[PDB]
Amino acid sequence: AMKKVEDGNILVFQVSMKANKYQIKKAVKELYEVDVLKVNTLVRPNGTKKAYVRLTADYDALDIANRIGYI
């Protein structure tokens, strides 16, 4: 996930199993003041949901991660 943040401009989140791509996109936008280019989701083998949130080219996911507290 850290490689994805640094290289692919993609924030990796654990999200609610009830949340869909629209809810994930609007929640990321609201919580982090960031435009979202795309959301991919999978259900992990441990029963949680993982969202790859690719941000638009305007924002740098590495600095977004730095701001929200994980480098």
Binding site: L31, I68, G69, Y70
Partner: protein, 119 residues
């Protein structure tokens, strides 16, 4: 030491909603921290504070609705008394004390008397 319900109860619903939002932000940043820091028990306090603020908000909302529905029949079912289902189906005190005019007359005329044997 976490929030106290008696301190929250003196606050308006706007202040309580704001405090809930801040507590949610704090919990989010705390679970971010937990990923690096091992054994971070401080998140339990914020979780209980969020629970307490939600409890007080719901208390205020439900009290306002009780005030809205005071006195009139047909309260909302989750504000009505939850006795058992059979107890809510049972006859009220007015019913089951209803008596016919004939029965009222005859039991007024001949009640059980108080009498002792004195030899």
């Amino acid at each position: 030491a976490g929030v106290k319900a008696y301190e929250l109860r003196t606050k308006s619903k706007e202040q309580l909603a704001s405090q809930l939002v801040d507590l949610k932000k704090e919990l989010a940043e705390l679970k971010v921290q937990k990923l690096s820091r091992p054994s971070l028990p401080k998140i339990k306090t914020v979780r209980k504070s969020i629970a307490c603020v939600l409890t007080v908000i719901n208390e205020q909302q439900r009290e306002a609705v009780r005030q809205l529905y005071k006195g009139k029949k047909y309260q909302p079912k989750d504000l009505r008394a939850k006795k058992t289902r059979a107890l809510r189906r049972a006859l009220t005190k007015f019913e089951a004390s209803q008596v016919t005019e004939k029965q009222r007359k005859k039991q007024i005329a001949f009640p059980q008397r108080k009498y002792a044997i004195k030899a």
